[PDB]
Amino acid sequence: HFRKHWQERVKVHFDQAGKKVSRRNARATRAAKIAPRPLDLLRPVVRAPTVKYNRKVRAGRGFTLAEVKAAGLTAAYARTIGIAVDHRRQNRNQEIFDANVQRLKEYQSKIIVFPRN
Amino acid sequence: VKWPEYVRVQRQKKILSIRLKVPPTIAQFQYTLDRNTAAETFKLFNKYRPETAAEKKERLTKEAAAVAEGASPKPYAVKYGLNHVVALIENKKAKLVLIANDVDPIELVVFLPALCKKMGVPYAIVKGKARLGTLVNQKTSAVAALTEVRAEDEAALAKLVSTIDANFADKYDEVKKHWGGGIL
């Protein structure tokens, strides 16, 4: 596969180390600006499609509205506490829903919220 | 000789409109209310001109001054907003509907007379949107209607509606006849 001018565009990843260092510095800056809160939002536990991988359990974008309601809070208030909320993900597994509810309940207990003022 | 391009275009537009055949939905205007009944309707409407910016500001300032030192009835005025008028119509809330015959977008108001007829609300067409605008402190409104007339003028409004029925709805009940604009 060398019928083109590929020699004009030969991207060599010499920067790997510098890019990793820059990513670490960006993470440190985010922590400095987001010190009290975690760097990443609490993602749910979800099951994968593509049965070749359905046996695997992996994270997801955010909890569904039903999961948030069952967790004892609201979607609008959940976002401010860093809980990821998905308005398009429908719940179709009772076992996964129970695990998500338990995870949300544990997260609510582990979090401490400072006064709004 | 020569004349301005815009003048020539507008003059030719009149000839085209006169000579061109229009569908029954169009030309429903220009079959307007007679001069006398339209004048009476405008006289009645003038008694209910909505409060203008200056008058409203004066009233609010007077109220503020009175409050600073230490229960009026519901205001009455004509409803003229096209969106507001259309929302009032089809709800059986309007008693009299006025429609301008010179709306620049014709399609904007073709359905309003037919919609009023379907809803049974009395309606009339008057010449000139400028006349409608003048009585509502606006440049143009293209429509005008009454919703809550005072008891003193309730009989006058009822008589005006009854007269307008015969004057316009009965005289022009055949407006759907052969296409207009058939002039040599």
């Binding site: 030969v10 | 030719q12 399609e107 073709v110």
Partner: protein, 186 residues
């Protein structure tokens, strides 16, 4: 709201009333210059649903464009709507092009109405819902095919049907036709 009635009426373009309206309007625009400003939009509902507002700063323009394209068989896929938007933007470079809508057409020429917003007017600059258009990155949206017609021409849409140009055909071609080499060869 009367806008629903206007939208429904505009759908029956083949109707006799709309046919006569188009016949009158095409001649009215054919007497005027190729590009001429419009005092008010002829389709208030379409403009309103396209972001039009009856406030100082918004301008409505009308432009005429020739129709048609084996010497003449060359496609030159430049769309008529895109050409009209580019022409009105060039004539109104100080303005910004938001979108355009079909209003009329003729056997020899097409007619489109375009909505423009002046970023210099304080009303737009002080409006939170419209101050975004004043960003320099939004300069000459039509010139880069950022309008609805431009985006449609570029084929930028979700799904497998637009994989070739899901994020720009040139960008995808450059990314795919590039040899990737790491420090530690795989």
């Amino acid at each position: 709201g009367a806008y629903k009635y206007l939208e429904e009426l505009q759908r029956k373009k083949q109707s006799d009333v709309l046919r006569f309206l188009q016949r009158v309007r095409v001649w009215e625009y054919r007497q005027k210059n190729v590009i001429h400003r419009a005092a008010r939009p002829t389709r208030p509902d379409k403009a309103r649903r396209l972001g039009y507002k009856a406030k100082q700063g918004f301008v409505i323009y009308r432009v005429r464009v020739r129709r048609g394209n084996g010497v003449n068989e060359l496609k030159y896929q430049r769309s008529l709507r895109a050409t009209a938007e580019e022409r009105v933007g060039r004539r109104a470079a100080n303005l910004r092009v938001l979108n355009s809508y079909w209003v009329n057409q003729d056997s020899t020429y097409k007619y489109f109405e375009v909505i423009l917003v002046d970023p210099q007017h304080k009303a737009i600059r002080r409006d939170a819902r419209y101050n975004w258009i004043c960003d320099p990155v939004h300069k000459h949206r039509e010139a880069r095919g950022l309008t609805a017609t431009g985006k449609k021409s570029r084929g930028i849409n979700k799904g497998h049907k637009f994989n070739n140009t899901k994020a720009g055909r040139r960008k995808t071609w450059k990314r795919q036709n590039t040899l990737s080499l790491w420090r530690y060869r795989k």
